[PDB]
């Protein structure tokens, strides 16, 4: 679509090499993906 030497990269994206997150905070930390619960008092 660009004719800009489109290399077919396949390896899954990993920018942890650049974001600068320190070693402790990148592997050990576990994130949770969830929809927030409706505040029951509302």
């Amino acid at each position: 679509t660009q004719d800009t030497q489109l290399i077919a990269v396949d390896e899954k994206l990993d920018i942890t090499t650049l974001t600068g997150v320190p070693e402790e905070h990148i592997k050990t930390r576990k994130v949770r993906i969830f929809v927030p619960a409706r505040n029951n008092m509302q």
Binding site: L13, I15, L18, G20, H25, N39
Partner: protein
């Protein structure tokens, strides 16, 4: 006008800019993907990333556009969108006293051609965007950090970056020099969940996905 609070509406400007929206769209259908005018009379020119150089030259050089002033060059990092970063240009036309906004999208890896040639003002704005966000700009005269401290790692304005950061500083006497330590707040940032659980604007209601 009976209403004393509502901001007045300028339909003449609204029609005027919308016609120019069809203009720019027809001249460059190769890069322009979407064109819209907001309720407060601002025109957004949604272009494709490779159109950063061609489209900008058109609005800067075409007789009927004559946008010869780079107002600003920003990006709004949206973690949601597939290509998170969204590079935004604002141009002011001295001859036609109008303002235009060309917006393009970009992920972390794909580079955007530097607009230094078409707008020499972009050069320093170019450096800031990479420094704060990490959007690398291709074929730039000198891409370098402009705001963060020397040797500072990470891109601060990126949403995933914490508010306080990772690295603190203090003077340590056994080394007689300022040294960096892991961040350790005497008070954590009290985050506030100050969002109403009730819809605010029926006009801007998203479709029921």
């Amino acid at each position: 006008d009976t209403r004393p609070t509502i901001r007045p509406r300028n339909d003449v400007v609204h029609k005027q800019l919308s016609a120019f929206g069809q203009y720019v769209a027809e001249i460059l259908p190769k890069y322009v993907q979407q064109v819209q005018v907001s309720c407060f009379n601002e025109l957004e020119i949604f272009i494709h990333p490779d159109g950063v150089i061609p489209v900008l030259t058109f609005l800067r050089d075409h007789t009927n556009a004559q946008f010869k002033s780079l107002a600003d060059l920003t990006a709004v990092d949206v973690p949601t969108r597939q290509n998170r970063f969204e590079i935004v240009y604002n141009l002011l036309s001295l001859r036609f006293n109008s303002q235009i906004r060309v917006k393009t999208y970009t992920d972390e890896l794909t580079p955007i051609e530097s607009s230094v040639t078409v707008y020499k003002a972009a050069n320093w704005y170019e450096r800031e965007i990479w420094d704060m966000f990490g959007v690398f700009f291709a074929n730039h005269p000198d891409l370098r950090r402009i705001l963060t401290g020397y040797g500072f790692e990470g891109h601060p304005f990126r949403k995933d970056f914490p508010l306080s950061g990772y690295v603190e500083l203090r003077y340590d006497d056994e080394v007689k020099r300022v040294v960096a330590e892991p961040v350790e707040l005497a008070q954590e940032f009290r985050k506030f969940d100050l969002n109403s659980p009730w819809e605010a604007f029926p006009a801007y209601r998203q479709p029921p996905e």
